Design an enzyme around this catalytic site. Structure first.
Site, short mmCIF file in Angstrom:
data_model
loop_
_atom_site.label_atom_id
_atom_site.label_comp_id
_atom_site.label_asym_id
_atom_site.label_seq_id
_atom_site.Cartn_x
_atom_site.Cartn_y
_atom_site.Cartn_z
N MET A 23 0.88 -1.14 0.00
CA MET A 23 0.00 0.00 0.00
C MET A 23 0.92 1.20 0.00
O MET A 23 2.10 1.08 -0.27
CB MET A 23 -0.85 -0.01 1.25
CG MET A 23 -1.28 -1.41 1.66
SD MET A 23 -1.37 -1.84 3.40
CE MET A 23 -2.36 -0.54 4.07
N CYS A 27 2.70 6.87 0.84
CA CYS A 27 2.57 5.95 -0.28
C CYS A 27 3.36 4.75 0.13
O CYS A 27 3.06 3.62 -0.25
CB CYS A 27 3.17 6.59 -1.53
SG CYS A 27 3.52 5.44 -2.87
N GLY A 28 4.37 5.05 0.94
CA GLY A 28 5.17 4.06 1.62
C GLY A 28 6.65 4.25 1.48
O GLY A 28 7.23 5.22 1.92
N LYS A 45 5.98 0.49 7.31
CA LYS A 45 6.55 1.53 6.50
C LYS A 45 8.05 1.30 6.35
O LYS A 45 8.78 1.16 7.34
CB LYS A 45 6.30 2.88 7.15
CG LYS A 45 7.01 4.04 6.47
CD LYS A 45 6.10 4.73 5.45
CE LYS A 45 6.36 6.23 5.42
NZ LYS A 45 6.60 6.81 6.78
N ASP A 129 3.56 18.80 12.52
CA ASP A 129 3.12 18.46 11.20
C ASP A 129 1.63 18.02 11.15
O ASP A 129 1.30 16.92 10.71
CB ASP A 129 4.03 17.43 10.54
CG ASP A 129 4.00 17.53 9.04
OD1 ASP A 129 4.01 18.67 8.52
OD2 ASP A 129 3.93 16.47 8.39
#
Length: 264
Positions: A23, A27-28, A45, A129
């Site tokens: 996945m 986006c990874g 990740k 963030d």
């Protein structure tokens, strides 16, 4: 390892983990993996190399923070193991073109603020963030924050003044306005620069009095987008706000909505 899942910390290696699918919207590269030792399916990740996300690995007892199982290091990456979520909020905004309903944004605000609050209190952290890529929703209705502490409009009005978390409240405001309406709150843009100009330049992009948003919602958003940072409210303050009070309390089937929005 270690992988800590379900109260116990285990020695583990990424190659030990069974890789299933890839996945994602996030986006990874983000991976879907299984940890043979306990049976759990999770999200890994993988990033390229050159930290202290120890904290997300220590924030297992906040239900609005995405759960971190552990961290892995190699020659090349740098693997982060986490509880698997459905999608980003940015992805949702695009995946449907239109805006996200207030009742959803309401539940989200509660989750987002309480997570930000925890970080500050439990570990004197400032997320920085705060934006729609950092807000994860799932098939089952859960809403959560992650990771990493442009990145342009989300910039507060201060934070570009003198070389000397109200900054996060700001970013919260922006995302809301962006996610409420369905288009960035500084529309026609000469990217990066004009944007930052307007932030410091113009008047905080409050919620359209036109679109059927409640007066508590428009009020929440407005207080967030308080230009004077000093007179801008802390998390303690926003948590008493009637928009939040309402949304702690109020049944909203985020679950079926998410499910249904997905089918498109």
């Amino acid at each position: 390892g270690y992988l800590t899942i379900g109260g116990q910390r285990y020695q583990a290696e990424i190659n030990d983990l069974e890789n299933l699918g890839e996945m994602g919207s996030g986006c990874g590269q983000v991976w879907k993996m299984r940890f043979r030792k306990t049976g759990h399916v999770i999200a890994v990740k993988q990033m390229r190399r050159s930290m202290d996300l120890d904290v997300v690995l220590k924030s297992h007892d906040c239900p609005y923070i995405v759960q971190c199982f552990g961290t892995f290091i190699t020659n090349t990456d740098v693997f982060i193991a986490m509880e698997l979520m459905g999608t980003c909020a940015e992805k949702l905004k695009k995946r449907m073109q239109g805006p996200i309903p207030e009742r959803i944004l309401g539940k989200m605000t509660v989750a987002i603020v309480k997570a930000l609050y925890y970080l500050k209190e439990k570990h004197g952290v400032i997320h920085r963030d705060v934006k729609p890529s950092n807000i994860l929703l799932d098939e089952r209705g859960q809403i959560k924050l992650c990771d990493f502490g442009g990145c342009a409009a989300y910039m507060a009005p201060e934070r570009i003044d003198p070389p000397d978390i109200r900054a996060d409240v700001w970013s919260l405001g922006i995302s809301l306005v962006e996610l409420a309406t369905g288009q960035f709150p500084y529309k026609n843009c000469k990217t990066d620069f004009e944007v930052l100009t307007k932030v410091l330049q113009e008047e905080p992009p409050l919620l359209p009095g036109h679109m059927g948003f409640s007066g508590d919602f428009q009020s929440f958003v407005k207080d967030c987008l308080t230009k004077d940072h000093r007179k801008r409210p802390k998390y303690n303050k926003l948590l008493e706000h009637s928009f939040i009070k309402r949304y702690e309390t109020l049944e909203v089937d985020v679950a079926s909505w998410f499910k249904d929005v997905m089918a498109k």
